[PDB]
Amino acid sequence: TSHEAGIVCRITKPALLVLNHETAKVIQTAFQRASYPDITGEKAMMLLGQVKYGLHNIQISHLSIASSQVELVEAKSIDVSIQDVSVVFKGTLKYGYTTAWWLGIDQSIDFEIDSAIDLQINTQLTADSGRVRTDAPDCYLSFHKLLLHLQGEREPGWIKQLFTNFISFTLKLVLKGQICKEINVISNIMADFVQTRAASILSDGDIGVDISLTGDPVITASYLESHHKGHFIYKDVSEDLPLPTFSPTLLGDSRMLYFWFSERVFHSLAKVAFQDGRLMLSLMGDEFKAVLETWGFNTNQEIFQEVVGGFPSQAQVTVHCLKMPKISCQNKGVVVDSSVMVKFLFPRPDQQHSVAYTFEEDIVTTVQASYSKKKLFLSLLDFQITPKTVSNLTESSSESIQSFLQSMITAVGIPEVMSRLEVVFTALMNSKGVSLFDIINPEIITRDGFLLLQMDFGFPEHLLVDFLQSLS
Numbered sequence: 001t002s003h004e005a006g007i008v009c010r011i012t013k014p015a016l017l018v019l020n021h022e023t024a025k026v027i028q029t030a031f032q033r034a035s036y037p038d039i040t041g042e043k044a045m046m047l048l049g050q051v052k053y054g055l056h057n058i059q060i061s062h063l064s065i066a067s068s069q070v071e072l073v074e075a076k077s078i079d080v081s082i083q084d085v086s087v088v089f090k091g092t093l094k095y096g097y098t099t100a101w102w103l104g105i106d107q108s109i110d111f112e113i114d115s116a117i118d119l120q121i122n123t124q125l126t127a128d129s130g131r132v133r134t135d136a137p138d139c140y141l142s143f144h145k146l147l148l149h150l151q152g153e154r155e156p157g158w159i160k161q162l163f164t165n166f167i168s169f170t171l172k173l174v175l176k177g178q179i180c181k182e183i184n185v186i187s188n189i190m191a192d193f194v195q196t197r198a199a200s201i202l203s204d205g206d207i208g209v210d211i212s213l214t215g216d217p218v219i220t221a222s223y224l225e226s227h228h229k230g231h232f233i234y235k236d237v238s239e240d241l242p243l244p245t246f247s248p249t250l251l252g253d254s255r256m257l258y259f260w261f262s263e264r265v266f267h268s269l270a271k272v273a274f275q276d277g278r279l280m281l282s283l284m285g286d287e288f289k290a291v292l293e294t295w296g297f298n299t300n301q302e303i304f305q306e307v308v309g310g311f312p313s314q315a316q317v318t319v320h321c322l323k324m325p326k327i328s329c330q331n332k333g334v335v336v337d338s339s340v341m342v343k344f345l346f347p348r349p350d351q352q353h354s355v356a357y358t359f360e361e362d363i364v365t366t367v368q369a370s371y372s373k374k375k376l377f378l379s380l381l382d383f384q385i386t387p388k389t390v391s392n393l394t395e396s397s398s399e400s401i402q403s404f405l406q407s408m409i410t411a412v413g414i415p416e417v418m419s420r421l422e423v424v425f426t427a428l429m430n431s432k433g434v435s436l437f438d439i440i441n442p443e444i445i446t447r448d449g450f451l452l453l454q455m456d457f458g459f460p461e462h463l464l465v466d467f468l469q470s471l472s
């Protein structure tokens, strides 16, 4: 089929398989969070009269898991089978022979309950409140054993029989209610957390993002796919604009993670970014000098002397966008068409001899992108510069002074701004946790109308441990 979405996330079977390595940590958390209530009553026992009993303070004492498999069922669910969770519970048995007063005082015996269980959890994914919800109403438990063992192996005659006939089957059913219920809460905590962190990665100060879902997620034998709006929000105003169409066939399913972004999302980001007054740069005395030195030039050079010239520590250059930049994705790259104002001031003791220029121009850049060693790299495939109105502010002006400045915009300006841009977007990623992941051979691929992120990842097994630990 086809979906209306600004942003699409596709998590493939291979990704689930490396995620499955930590299924046991999740099941462990579920058992540790479950409540096991006191089992009490007072029953007539054979030859022994009314006996009042209670199993008390049931606590998990040991828990291990043998293995887990994961399978995607087309249009239905993510199905995880877990074999041989062995749980040892401990508790305290308290009873007294109520009617048989001649048999002596009430008793207290420590016990353990030993079980082995296979679980089958079939999780369905649905949209709720623009959020992906998880639901496993089909959560199967199969007990291999549930055996009571008293400390000291005491048997007056009524205990093993009572446990077997009145206690285990209703306990099994209580166990299932608690475990399955708690599998459901952890699953929804983990789903909601990812979504909130996704949104956080796309947010900054007064800039937020709406990644509300546009329909129920999709499951096939090969992947699962969520479709989001991707509208940027500025000071809590958003524009609920029509959604671009998305075609599932656009994506492969061999990498672990695919992210498809419409160019409409870039339009949205350029829009709020411009509104926030962010698309600007200022270089004063020694910052201007430092920028030239980065690109292999030097304010003390002969060729800079007529422009800068005597007081290079007092140079001033500003760039700012005049209107919102225009961003397109194309097969060749991402094209940003920017209308800028570049202002120069290289003062002299006499202000009449200060070189002072302003350049209104469109600069169009075709850019390709790389991710490597935890950094974003931006590449210039080509550029075009078309001035609209150049102004000199003093008499100190010449076709060759103007052409020096233009050449600086081109040779130093463009590559400097690109450098600053990649540094800024890399720091936005890092500060939101992206650095912590092992992103493996990611590809950034531009096409007509959309950008593609494809990658494998490594899951630092300690990150899930700490998150589950942080749940308390």
Ligand SMILES: CCCCCCCC/C=C\CCCCCCCC(=O)OC[C@H](COP(=O)(O)OCC[N+](C)(C)C)OC(=O)CCCCCCC/C=C\CCCCCCCC
Pocket (backbone or CB within 6 Å): 201, 202, 203, 204, 207, 261, 265, 266, 269, 270, 273, 277, 278, 279, 280, 281, 319, 320, 321, 325, 327, 336, 338, 340, 417, 420, 421, 424, 425, 428
């Ligand atoms: C679409 C991207 C917009 C930028 C591309 C336009 C090309 C540039 C066009 C013209 C250049 C002229 C001006 C050059 C100066 C910019 C270069 C630079 O020097 O610096 C980049 C700055 C960051 O500088 P600054 O914030 O300190 O402001 C400084 C301003 N002053 C001090 C007043 C607060 O501007 C920014 O980066 C703006 C972006 C910040 C967005 C923050 C929200 C985080 C959201 C998402 C993260 C990534 C999205 C993931 C992919 C989804 C698809 C969209």
Ligand SMILES: CCCCCCCC/C=C\CCCCCCCC(=O)OC[C@H](COP(=O)(O)OCC[N+](C)(C)C)OC(=O)CCCCCCC/C=C\CCCCCCCC
Pocket (backbone or CB within 6 Å): 009, 011, 016, 017, 019, 020, 021, 022, 023, 026, 070, 078, 080, 190, 191, 193, 194, 197, 198, 201, 257, 430, 431, 432, 433, 434, 436, 437, 463, 464, 467
């Ligand atoms: C993480 C999901 C990866 C796989 C899904 C890929 C889809 C990606 C979609 C969108 C991108 C969103 C990014 C994913 C979220 C992690 C981002 C992250 O890098 O965040 C780091 C933090 C660590 O510190 P902090 O929480 O204090 O935040 C403060 C962070 N600072 C201090 C660095 C600023 O948090 C953490 O890493 C918490 C890590 C544990 C949370 C796992 C939640 C669900 C993941 C796996 C489920 C395992 C179940 C196995 C069953 C499989 C059966 C199929």
Ligand SMILES: CCCCCCCC/C=C\CCCCCCCC(=O)O[C@H]1CC[C@@]2(C)C(=CC[C@H]3[C@@H]4CC[C@H]([C@H](C)CCCC(C)C)[C@@]4(C)CC[C@@H]32)C1
Pocket (backbone or CB within 6 Å): 007, 008, 009, 011, 019, 023, 026, 027, 078, 080, 121, 123, 132, 134, 183, 187, 190, 191, 194, 195, 196, 198, 199, 201, 202, 211, 224, 226, 228, 257, 259, 434, 437, 439, 457
């Ligand atoms: C992994 C590398 C991350 C680094 C990526 C850096 C790229 C940054 C750039 C752009 C950010 C893109 C923003 C896009 C918006 C995405 C929206 C977005 O966040 O989509 C998320 C929606 C929910 C979910 C489908 C997901 C994640 C994992 C899923 C969960 C894993 C386990 C969960 C099971 C239910 C657990 C069952 C266990 C039990 C023992 C039976 C499961 C499947 C629930 C749903 C999530 C992606």
Ligand SMILES: CCCCCCCC/C=C\CCCCCCCC(=O)O[C@H]1CC[C@@]2(C)C(=CC[C@H]3[C@@H]4CC[C@H]([C@H](C)CCCC(C)C)[C@@]4(C)CC[C@@H]32)C1
Pocket (backbone or CB within 6 Å): 288, 291, 292, 317, 319, 334, 336, 338, 340, 342, 363, 365, 367, 368, 369, 371, 376, 378, 408, 409, 412, 413, 414, 416, 417, 418, 421, 425, 429, 434, 439, 442, 444, 451, 453, 455
């Ligand atoms: C001495 C100096 C005097 C000169 C004065 C200066 C004068 C200069 C004047 C004007 C300069 C203007 C020209 C420069 C404009 C260049 C435009 C320019 O560089 O535009 C680029 C801006 C960043 C971006 C939007 C882009 C394309 C790629 C995008 C990236 C793709 C994925 C990236 C994700 C966030 C990361 C996911 C990776 C994951 C962690 C695995 C993403 C979306 C970041 C944003 C970029 C185009």
Ligand SMILES: *[C@@H]1O[C@H](CO[C@@H]2O[C@@H](C)[C@@H](O)[C@@H](O)[C@@H]2O)[C@@H](O[C@H]2O[C@H](CO)[C@@H](O)[C@H](O)[C@H]2NC(C)=O)[C@H](O)[C@H]1NC(C)=O
Pocket (backbone or CB within 6 Å): 392, 393, 394, 395, 396, 397, 398, 399, 400, 402
């Ligand atoms: C900006 O410099 C002007 C002199 O420069 C030339 O003309 C520019 C338009 C530009 O093409 C540049 O490359 C050329 O070198 C200057 O313009 C005029 O004014 C002065 C004094 O009134 C006059 O002597 C000069 O000959 C005039 N030139 C022309 C061709 O019009 C202008 O004064 C200056 N701007 C300001 C406000 O300082």
Ligand SMILES: [Cl-]
Pocket (backbone or CB within 6 Å): 154, 155, 156
């Ligand atoms: Cl006894």
